Amino acid sequence: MTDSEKSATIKVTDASFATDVLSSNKPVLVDFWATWCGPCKMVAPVLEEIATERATDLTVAKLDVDTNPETARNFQVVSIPTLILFKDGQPVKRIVGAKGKAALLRELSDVVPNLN
Known part of the structure; x- marks a missing residue:
């Protein structure tokens, strides 16, 4: 990862x-x-670590509901953090509340091969 490989x-x-x-x-x-x-701060190192380590398998992004309520109503945010996994731009699953790396990567491994 670099300034061009952001x-x-x-x-x-x-x-x-x-x-x-x-x-x-x-x-x-x-x-x-x-x-x-x-x-939300509890998942900050978890989302950073999976996204830094597995960038060739998946992408991780964040939406700031504190300044953008318009996408927050789009996916019906009610409690935070709301984590939602897409594949090929189509939604697969949603969880609300904090994660660890093992649980986040296992529910990702349900969507693409890894734990095999």
């Missing part, structure tokens, strides 16, 4: 989300969160 994770906005997430060929994991939220 380091993980990316951030998405209501004008660009459809090009960044829904136009992707990949598994794309999206976290709908706020930067002051306790369980």
